[PDB]
Structure formats: C-alpha cells, structure tokens
Design a protein around this nucleic acid. Structure first.
Lengths: 156, 282, 225, 259
RNA sequence: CGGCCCCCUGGACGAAGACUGACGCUCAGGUGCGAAAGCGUGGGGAGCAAACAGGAUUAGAUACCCUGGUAGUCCACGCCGUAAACGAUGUCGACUUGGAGGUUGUGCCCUUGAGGCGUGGCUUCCGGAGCUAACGCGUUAAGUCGACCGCCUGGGGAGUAC
RNA sequence: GUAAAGCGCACGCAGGCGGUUUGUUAAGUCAGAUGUGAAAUCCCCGGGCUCAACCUGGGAACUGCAUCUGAUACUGGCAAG
C-alpha cells in the first residue's frame, strides 16, 4: 500500500592514511498516497544497502498532512537551511508542477495538483526537508476553526 | 517472526481447523500493524497457513481495546454495526442486516461456532430489525408485568410512563431529579412514587415470602406430576408440606381452596397416595 | 492519596539553589528561602495524584513499568520499590540506547541469562580458574547493568524517573519511542520532555523514598484491579 | 491555601541560619560519612571526625541531634558547613558566662607555651594562650606534674581572634588586622589555626582575625617536592603553624609548618 | 585619553519634584573632528630609530642578530584626511526565558557587622528560545518588528586608467 | 559579523517618516455614476469557409484619465488640547 521513491543517491568520500574510502548516500521518501509522508537518508559502503536503510528510516518517523481532496488547503511556504520552497494549491487536472526531489515527496504524499517552486538552494536533501516542513505546518479549515473557537461555516 | 519476539499480542485463537481460522491480535501502538505482519506481501505468509495443514479460511482481526471491540472483530470477516451486553453471560447479540447477514452468518454450523469461541463465551447473531423488535419487548415489560411496583391512579400513570425511560423497575437508584422537571412536581411525592416502586419490590419480596418467606412445599410435593407451582403453593397453604401431607388431606379439606376443584383434588390425593404406597417400586 | 504534611516532613518542598534553577520551572516554584528555591506544594500535590492515577490505570491494563534512578544515593531504594510491585528497574547507569536500541540490548539480556543459568542450574563446576573469574566478572557486570530489566521481554509501557536532568537520555529515548514518562523534576531540571511532571526534591533521600512508595502502592493496586 | 503561605512563614519562624537549632537527626551512619537532615534542601555529607569525642570513637547513633552550620548553599549538590563549628558557639557561650560572675570555672591544664602562652584545652578542643595567662604569678607549671588539673582563669583574650589564655593553678586567686600587625610578629610566634583550602601549592591556614597564611608547599613536612599537601595534613583542621614572616603591606603572612 | 597641582571647559548618570508641551527620528549634498606615518615654517633633540656605515650569518644576505647612526619621534602654528580608523556588526525606537560578575549611583532595613531587600546607568563572560551555510549571536541579537540612510551583484583586469 | 556589501566618527539643510485626544476639512483613500479610453489585436460565448489556420456577430477587457455625487476608518491639511 505504501509507495516509496528513491530521490537521489550520491557517492561521498572519507580520506584516510591509505587513500579515499567511498560510500553511498540514498535519499528516499515514502507515503501511502494520503496525508501520511516520511523521508529517509541512508548511508552504506554499497548502494543497495544504503537505499534499503533509507527505506527503513523513512518508514519510521512518518508525518501526517491534512489534504483537501487532491490538492492543498492553502498556499504554504517551507524552508530548510538553503532550500526555500513555495507551493500552492491548484485545480484538478493541473498535476504536480514541481521540480526534482520536491516533486517526488509530493507524489508519495498523494497530492495530485500543485503549483510549486523551489527558491534558493535545490540540494535534494534540504529541499525535501523544506517540503515536508511546509506540508506539516499547513493546517486545515476544521483545525483553524477548532483553534479559534468557531464553526467551519463561520470561517468559510 | 514479530509474534515470536513479543511484537504481535496474540491472546485467544478461537479457530476451527479444517474450515475457517479467524483470530484477532493486539499490539503495542508503535507503527507495527499486527494483521499486516501476519498477512505479508499480498498474503505472502497468509498463503503459507492457507495451504499449511490444509485448505483453511484463516483470518486476522486488528484487535482494538477491551472485549467490546473483540465482539465486532469476532464477527469478521463481515460487517458488524452494534451488539447488546449483560453481566456474567453477556451473550454478544450480533446486530447486522439480512443482506450482510448472508456472509456474516456464512454457514449455519461454521461461522456461528467459530465466532462463538472468538470472545470465549458465545454470540447470538440477530438482525437490525430483530434488535428493535426485542428492544421494544423491554420498554413495555418494566411496564409489561401487570404493573406490580408503585401504583396509584392510572391516568397520571400513563402520563408519567410516557416520559419515563425503562418504566420504573428499580429506577430509584437512577437520577432522582429529572422527573421533577416534569410539568407537575410540588412536594416530594413522585420522588415518593419511586419509593412506592421500591416498596412494591419489598411487596414482591413479601410475595416471595408468600411462596417461600412463609415456608413453601417440599421437593416431593413440588415434583408431583399433575400439579404446578401455584397449585402446590395453594395446597401447601393449608398446613401441608410434603406429598404425604397432601395425601393425608381429603377432597373436602382441599375444597376450601377455590383454585382446586373436587375432581382435581381427588386426582391429586390419589396420585399422592399412589406415590406413598408404591414408593418401593421405581 | 499522599498528604501534604507528609511531603513537607519528607522535604519535598525544598528545591535547588537560585543560581542553578530552570525558568521553565518558574510555575512550579513558590518562593526562595535563604537563597534556595521552594517548590509550591499546592501545585505539586494534585499533579502527583494525577500521575499516580495514570500509573494505576497503566497497571490495570497489564502495563510494564520501568523505574529509573542512577543517583547512587537512592539506587537501593528504587530497586526495592521495583521489587515490591514486581516491576522492572535501572538503578545503575542507564545504557545509552537501552530502549531505542533494544534489539541489541536484548541479546545482552540473553547473554546475561545464559551466564546466570550456567552459574546456578548447571552445577557443572570444573572450569579453568582465570576463565572462571572472567565469567564471574562478566556476570557481575551484567547483573549490575541489566538485572531489573532481564525479565522484561519487550519495551515498557511507562517510565517512572527520579531525576529528569540526570536521566535525560532515558527521557529522550522514551519520547522518541513515545513511552509515557513520569518524572520527579527539581527546580534545576527540564520538564519539557516529561509527560507527567512531578516537582519534588530529587536529591533528598526520604522524599525520594516517599515518591517511590506511593508509586509502588498504586502499581500494586492497579495489578489487583 | 494560605495554609501553605502561613506554613512557609511558620517554618521560617522555626529555623535559623547558623548551627544553632539542634535539628538534624542522624539518619545514616557508615564509615567514614555521617549524614543528617535539619530541614534543609539536602542531607549533609558529614565527616566522622566532627563526631568522635576525645579518644577516637563515635558517640551518636541513629536519631541523634546536633545542629551544623549554614549561610553557604549548594556547591553543586548538598547542604552544610560542619557542626563542630556549632560547638564553637557553645564554647564561646561558656567563655562569655564568666563575665556574669567574673569567673568561668572548668578544668584547664596548660603544659607548655606554644606562642609564649601555655595551651589550655577544654573538653574536646585545645586553644592557645598568651604567656601571662597560664600562671597567675611566675609560678610556671613546668615544675607542676605534667598536664596537671586545675581550671582556667582568664588572663587575656583577643576578642576577634580566638586566642584565649587561662590561669591554671592557684584556686585562691580571684583596616583592622593590618595597622597593628605586630602581635604575633617577632620572629617565631606559633599559632593554632584551622586550614581552609589546599590549592595544590598551599594549605591556607588562616585563623587570626581576617588574615591569610600560606604554609605553601616547601616546609609542611620533611620532604620537599613530592608531597602534595592534601595527602600530608588535612582539610579543615587546627594545626601547629607559626608566622616565620609578615608583610603588613602586601598582606602576605607566610606561615610555616616544618617547625 | 594615564605622575600630582591649579585655571578655563564639554558630556554622562542618579534623586526627587517643578516646567515646556511632539519641540521628535533619520539624512543625499554640506560642514566639522579624524591614529600612525608624511609635508611646510620656526624651535627642540636625552632615549629610540626608517635611511646609511661597519661586523657577523649565509651559496648569496641590499634581511633577520651585533656596533654605531641621521630624518622622525617632542613643542608651536598650518596642511594631509588615510588605517584590520574592527564588534570586520549604520543610527533611533519598541518587544521576547536566565545565570555569574565588575563598576557607579540611589531608596528602605535593627548598617545589631564586612551585611539584608530592592531600584537606576554603563559594562565582561556563559547560555535558552529564536536565528544562522555553519561558525556562532543570544535583552549590549546576528531574535521578533518599525523609520531613515549607506553599500553589494562572479573572479581577475582594478579601487587601476582617463 | 566571516562569502560582494555598514561611510572612520559625528552635526545637520533639503528630503523621508512622525506620540496621544477632540473638532473640522475632504487632498490622498474608498464607493457609485457620467464622459472618454478609435478600430483591429488578446480573452468569453457564438456563426462561416468540409476541418483548421483564416474570416466573422455580440460581449468582456482596455487595470487609466477627467468630472459630478457620496463615505470619513486611516494618511494629510487647518484649529484647539
């Protein structure tokens, strides 16, 4: 039921007395096609093991997101370290207008319709984190009604 | 292996090997998903048990909390909506619809027993309409019992039992302040009407004294053929206690009670005398 | 259940100095006496009662309780408390990642159990002396570390702690996993990670004992229930 | 309610700062630490050497009560300054009692003049005296039976520096530190001073009215450099020391202990 | 900006009151002050010391080290207008958890003692939330905001040429 | 702050911004109307060339400007505090 996308894999080095020890980092993200989403960032000497780790980590520490039907509930900004991200709810049919790692996380999240730009850095890791942050902070109408002591129709 | 390493709380396994094997399992809330692990990739491990000892209809239910959630889970795989309860023998009265009852009941002698041991006790599969039918068969009776409780005038009793929930059968132990909201509550009298019901219960206990509280008949007189409990009480009210004491009485002595006729008292005296005389023979 | 007079007698109301406090504890502080913080018993008592009730409820559903104190003043007492209600405890140094990294520690438990078995049930003696001394030393080490939690099986369903600042590693582990935390929190301590905070003197022995005894009683009650 | 506020001020009313109210009940003994609870934030890590009397064995079991001392709070965890200092207040009260009748009567046995004046000891403690006070007259207890028993009749006290000199015999007979710092000066006046803190080059014995002495590291013993003062003397103990040197200007009285 | 004294003189802070009644903040151009070195004229010249000379060192030593040593450093009056002129942090105002100090006021308190409880100004260190690329900053912000100005737009060429 | 980037520091004209209360005005601001904002082009609904491009009817738009009539919270002006 869960869908999982390996966003990126990158070779990283550690210099030692002999020479360079190489290793691989795997950035993955998983989601159930609904609110729930989680990213994982694994590391191992070989690629498949590292992606396996990324999947494992993503599977835990997931996070829920309040989706109005296929899209978002309102325009939302999210940042992390360099990657600053804007994403905006959009009409059915438009699809996921987003670039790169961001796209991936959106798809697994089960959002189908967004207009979305990544300002600043586009370092996959940071940008996916920023996306997750923007999705988490985003609140729903019912939530704001509760926050504020009102009905949904009062807020419209 | 999760179950083996204490990750899948498995209590009872009410299953019928050789047919259906539905069993519920609990888990410590930690993103474990018990049934999921028991099933696997597209019933990966589920297929193993399916063709393990033999073609069995194995099923897993996501145990929620306590026994109330175990009831519905024991009705799976189907569609439960509601259920009734009681004391020691609660008897989970399955409440579903005829359309969904076909699958819920599945087989007369299969899912009615497999789901019976599910909770460990026993279940009574019923219908949505059946529930309501029996539901009302309870409102009238704390009333449907010749009204042997409080009692005063009847015109006020109808207007009181209109708003009255669960009649008045032992309702004094409930909120004694919401009936005062009723249009007509001066001095504590309705709070007193409920007290009358309590007195009626004591009166019912006095009726038990009339049938036990004042020494009712022995086992020989009660198990005599051709006599009921009321007839045995009416016969024993004249000082008799045993079947031999009833045999000592005559038709004219038993004729003082209008409940027994001369032919019936003669037949009872003859039966008691035959039981006394032919007691050596079984 | 636990009265205010008794707590006063114990020395709960006493709290750390005025240069060592935490401003998140400002609500729970009453005043400062001789340049020492005083804990507000009025606000402490009801919450302590609450915490007790929650612990009881946990027990009722057959919850596993872990008692943590590594202050080495009240290690004996916390062990005693754990045993009274036959629950589990960590009276010596908490192993980093005991709960988060359970699966590894579970092997540790198993090795300890095996060693215990060898010691007692085997009755095999005839072991090379040095080797026998080494095995004994290993046994002692593992008993000290994991004695209370050896029969635990899996992960606790609640975590009682005697000091938050001292056992912050355990607290953090519980939070990461989501286990309910029941902490005694002095003025210097940080109660943010704690779910059911308890403002009381972690340091004083008698106060610690009192805390423990009430907790044990309510666990026993929940078990009885 | 105000129950608690009233109690807080009540409990203020029923404790004081110094070691005055004998309140701490000994709730655990083990060698070498005694511990009490005087209604303080924590229990005191008491030495055994505050609580053995005059021949080297302990005297108080569980439940026993002595007050300790205060006005210093939490070096990182704990509570007190020790209780024998409390005993010093009782000794001061006994010494003051003399004033009432102009005669304090105890036993005082002064064999030899440490710093000019015979040393007189009251039951547990031993104090040092100025010369004249040991004897009312030139009697000179050197010819008396050693460590003899008479009494103490006060000749001289310094009144800020705990130097008290007393008259053992003859029952019939009956800013501030630094301007005139020439009393313990001349070359070699020995003193009885409690050490305060050993700074790994020193010991800091300093008793005589708000001064500071250093017996640092060189004398201390009859080994020079491998000594490490903490091993060789004590913490918080009254010792043999004398001046050897005074600055009145740069306030460095450089005492010694090899004497 | 550092020995004391005197004369003339600017600012800061606190204590209470009394008064004025938005008179304020910022500031392109403009004006002033602006280390050291440097320039001009006139004085002065102990020590130190660019330049210079000799002796060493060295492969060489137009240096480092040594022996000397003149401009200058000092004073007066002018000019110069730059420095890692740095907190590499524009000015003004408001708001946001804490601890340990220093310094300088001031109110009360038995100053019963060097103290006890406050309340102002300036100031050093540590550290929370938050912020930050991180380092770190953290009520003296590099946090949360407002007003005005200054400045940046790849490295070199170049802060150079005209 | 360290990546390029806080004038060495100040005073200060012009300029920018401006505590709080009441009154007034109605400049800014907002609302409505009128006039205009060529046609074509763009966009919406239609029509015609077999379709399309293309042609084409009607609308919308042309974010503006000018006026007149209102609104007066805020900003401004004026008057008193």
């Amino acid at each position: 039921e869960l869908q999982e996308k390996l966003i990126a894999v990158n070779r990283v080095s550690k210099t030692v007395k002999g020479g360079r020890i190489f290793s691989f980092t795997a950035l993955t993200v998983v989601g159930d096609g609904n609110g729930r989403v989680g990213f994982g960032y694994g590391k191992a000497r070989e690629v498949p093991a590292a992606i396996q780790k990324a999947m494992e980590k993503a599977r835990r520490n997931m996070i829920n997101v309040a989706l109005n039907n296929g899209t978002l509930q309102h325009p939302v900004k999210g940042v992390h370290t360099g990657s600053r991200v804007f994403m905006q709810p959009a009409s059915e049919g438009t699809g996921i207008i987003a670039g790169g790692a961001m796209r991936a996380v959106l798809e697994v999240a089960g959002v189908h319709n967004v207009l979305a730009k990544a300002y600043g850095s586009t370092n996959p890791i940071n940008v996916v984190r920023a996306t997750i942050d923007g999705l988490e902070n985003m609140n729903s109408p019912e939530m704001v009604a509760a926050k504020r002591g009102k009905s949904v129709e009062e807020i419209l | 292996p999760e179950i083996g390493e204490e990750v899948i709380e498995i209590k009872a396994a009410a299953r019928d090997p050789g047919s259906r094997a539905k069993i519920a399992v609990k888990t410590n809330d930690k993103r474990i998903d018990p049934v999921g692990a028991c099933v696997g990739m597209r019933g990966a491990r589920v297929q193993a048990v399916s063709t393990e000892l033999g073609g069995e209809r194995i099923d897993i239910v996501l145990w929620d909390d306590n026994p109330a959630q175990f009831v519905i889970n024991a009705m799976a795989p189907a569609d439960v909506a509601s259920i009734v309860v009681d004391e020691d023998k609660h008897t989970m009265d399955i409440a579903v619809e005829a359309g969904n009852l076909a699958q819920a009941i599945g087989r007369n002698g299969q899912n009615v027993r497999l789901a019976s041991q599910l909770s460990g006790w026993e279940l009574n599969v019923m219908t949505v309409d059946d529930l309501q039918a029996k539901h009302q068969a309870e409102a009238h009776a704390a009333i449907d019992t010749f009204t042997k409780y409080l009692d005063i005038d009847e015109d006020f009793a109808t207007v009181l039992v209109e708003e009255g929930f669960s009649t008045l059968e032992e309702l004094a132990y409930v909120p004694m302040k919401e009936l005062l909201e009723i249009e007509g509550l001066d001095e504590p009298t309705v709070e007193a009407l409920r007290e009358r019901a309590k007195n009626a219960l004591a009166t019912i206990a006095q009726a038990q004294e009339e049938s036990l509280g004042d020494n009712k008949p022995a086992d020989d007189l009660l198990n005599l053929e051709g006599v009921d409990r009321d007839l045995a009480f009416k016969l024993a009210a004249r000082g008799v206690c045993t079947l031999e004491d009833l045999a000592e009485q005559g038709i004219d002595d038993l004729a003082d009670i209008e409940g027994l006729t001369d032919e019936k008292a003669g037949a009872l005296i003859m039966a008691a005398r035959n039981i006394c005389w032919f007691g050596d023979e079984a | 259940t636990v009265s205010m007079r008794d707590m006063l007698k114990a020395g709960v109301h006493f709290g750390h100095q005025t240069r060592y406090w935490n401003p998140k504890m400002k609500p729970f502080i009453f005043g400062a006496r001789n340049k020492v913080h005083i804990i507000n018993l009025e606000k402490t008592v009801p919450m302590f009662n609450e915490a007790l009730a929650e612990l009881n409820k946990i027990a009722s559903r057959k919850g596993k309780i872990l008692f943590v104190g590594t202050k080495r003043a009240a290690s004996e007492a916390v062990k005693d408390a754990a045993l009274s209600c036959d629950q589990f405890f960590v009276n010596h140094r908490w192993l980093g990642g005991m709960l988060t990294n359970w699966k590894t520690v579970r092997q540790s438990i198993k090795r300890l159990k095996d060693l215990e078995t060898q010691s007692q049930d085997g009755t095999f003696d005839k072991l090379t002396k040095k080797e026998a001394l080494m095995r004994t030393r290993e046994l002692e080490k593992l008993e000290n570390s994991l004695g209370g939690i050896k029969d635990m099986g899996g992960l606790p369903d609640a975590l009682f702690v005697i000091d938050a600042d001292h056992e912050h590693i355990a607290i953090k582990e519980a939070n990461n996993l989501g286990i309910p935390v029941f902490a005694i929190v002095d003025t210097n301590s940080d109660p943010d990670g704690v779910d059911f905070v308890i403002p009381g003197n972690d340091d004083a022995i008698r106060a610690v004992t009192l805390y423990l005894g009430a907790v044990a009683a309510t666990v026993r009650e929940g078990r009885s229930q | 309610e105000s129950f608690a506020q009233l109690f807080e001020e009540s409990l203020k009313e029923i404790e004081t700062r110094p070691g005055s109210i004998v309140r701490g009940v000994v709730v655990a003994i083990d060698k070498d630490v005694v511990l009490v609870d005087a209604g303080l934030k924590s229990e005191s890590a008491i030495p055994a050497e505050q609580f053995k009397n005059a021949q080297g064995e302990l005297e108080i079991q569980v439940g026993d009560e002595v007050d300790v001392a205060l006005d210093a709070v939490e070096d990182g965890f704990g509570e007190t300054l020790l209780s024998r200092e409390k005993a010093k207040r009782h000794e001061a009260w006994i010494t003051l009692e003399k004033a009432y009748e102009d005669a304090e009567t105890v036993t005082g046995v002064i064999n030899g003049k440490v710093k000019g004046g015979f040393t007189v000891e009251l039951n547990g403690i031993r104090a040092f005296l100025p010369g004249s006070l040991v004897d009312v007259r030139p009697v000179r207890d050197t010819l008396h039976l050693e460590g003899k028993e008479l009494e103490f009749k006060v000749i001289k006290l310094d009144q800020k520096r705990n130097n008290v000199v007393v008259s053992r015999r003859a029952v019939i007979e009956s800013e501030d530190p630094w301007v005139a710092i020439a009393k313990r000066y001349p070359e070699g006046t020995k003193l009885t001073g409690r050490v305060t803190n050993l700074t790994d080059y020193g010991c800091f014995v300093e008793i005589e009215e708000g001064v500071e002495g250093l017996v640092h590291v060189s004398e201390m013993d009859w080994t020079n450099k491998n000594i490490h003062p903490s091993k060789v003397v004590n913490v918080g103990d009254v010792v043999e020391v004398m001046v050897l040197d005074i600055d009145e200007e740069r306030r460095r009285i450089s005492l010694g202990l090899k004497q």
